[PDB]
Amino acid sequence: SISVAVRVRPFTEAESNRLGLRKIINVVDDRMLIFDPPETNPLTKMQRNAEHRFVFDRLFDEDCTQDQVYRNTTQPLLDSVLDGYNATVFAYGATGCGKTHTISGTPEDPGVIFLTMKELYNRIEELKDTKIIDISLSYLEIYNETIRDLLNPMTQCKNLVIREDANNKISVSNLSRHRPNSVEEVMQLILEGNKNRTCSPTEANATSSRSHAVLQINVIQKDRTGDITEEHTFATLSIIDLAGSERGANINKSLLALGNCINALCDPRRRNHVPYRDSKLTRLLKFSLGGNCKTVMIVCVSPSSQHYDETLNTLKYADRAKEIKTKLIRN
Ligand SMILES: Nc1ncnc2c1ncn2[C@@H]1O[C@H](COP(=O)(O)OP(=O)(O)O)[C@@H](O)[C@H]1O
Ligand SMILES: [Mg+2]
């Protein structure tokens, strides 16, 4: 049960000033776009006579708002999370296409993490009469199959081990957890943590395109009007700003393994043989992908014709997150 959305980042000012470029995607409606689309002036098309069609669960064009992306991706998940089920939201795509803008955003235009925390704080506050709710978050990096605490950068990578604990809960040893008293501090914590991500080998103040950033929100709740019990619910909402998708084995082991696991989940014959074990990222999300965990991937693409190749790749990647139409072969 994997949901795929596409978000086309807007042009920059120079990009729009060179329109030599041309818009390589036409967002027809809320569910279908056209890649490499035909030429929109009837006369000009007639002169040219002298494309790929894509349907996804939800489309966001250059001018969509952060609130529009949030309400149509992760807000519908919150109920699951408060009912005790895990939920997961990815930002996939090539570097420069708006992954970090969508997940983290800016203090002026906050992204999915921020708005998720805002709505969750409100929800906690409304159901305070009947529920005891503990809300906490952590924010880690997977780079070159090494785990770093983006909110406690002084803990040694070897001390951050993925543990499958009791029940069916994946955890990370010695990973710090934080209870921001407010939304302002949620954003502060996002920004500091992003500042802690691995630098690009090239220039500076440049997060490496190979950095996975995994935010995790742990929601635990318990009945307040019953008697003293051990019944609780405990769910994890994972919001991931993935490494860049553009073209040692451990550099992009996690990205490739996420791809392979999505393949397996979309194929009914191998959906029970998902290779979560093949990387840090997929191991961390062993109980945070399959049908059980509501999973939505936000594919982020560039409208610029300059990015034809990568964008097409990305779209085709999104296109193969669709369930395979198998046949019930007999004998
Ligand atoms: N929807 C958007 N609206 C305005 N600016 C955007 C949008 N998406 C991306 N940007 C800008 O484009 C640049 C690249 O975005 P970023 O999120 O860093 O891409 P990625 O994280 O995929 O490398 C950033 O400076 C960001 O501010
Ligand atoms: Mg980024």
Residue numbers in the entry: 25 to 43, 101 to 131, 143 to 339, 353 to 436
Sentences from the paper on this structure:
Kinesin-8s are dual-activity motor proteins that can move processively on microtubules and depolymerize microtubule plus-ends, but their mechanism of combining these distinct activities remains unclear. The pathogenic yeast Candida albicans expresses a single kinesin-8 homolog, dubbed CaKip3, whose motor domain shares 60% sequence identity with that of S. cerevisiae Kip3. To understand the mechanistic basis for the dual-functionality of kinesin-8, we obtained seven cryo-EM structures of Candida albicans Kip3 bound to either the microtubule lattice or curved microtubule end mimics, and a microtubule-unbound CaKip3 X-ray structure. Our findings implicate loop-2 as a tubulin protofilament shape sensor that regulates conformational changes in the kinesin-8 motor domain, which can either induce curvature of protofilaments at the microtubule end, leading to microtubule depolymerization, or enable forward displacement of the neck linker for processive motility if the motor domain is bound to protofilaments in the microtubule lattice.
To visualize the microtubule-unbound ADP state of CaKip3, we determined a 2.0 Å X-ray crystal structure of a construct containing the motor domain and a slightly truncated neck-linker (CaKip3-MDN, residues 1–436). The CaKip3-MDN-ADP crystal structure has a partially open nucleotide pocket and an undocked neck-linker. The Switch I region (loop-9) is well-defined but angled away from ADP, while the Switch II region (loop-11) that coordinates microtubule sensing and nucleotide binding is mostly disordered. The electron density from the CaKip3-MDN-ADP crystal allowed us to model residues Phe116 to Ala131 of loop-2, which includes a proline-rich region and a ~10-residue helical sequence that is shared by some kinesin-8s.
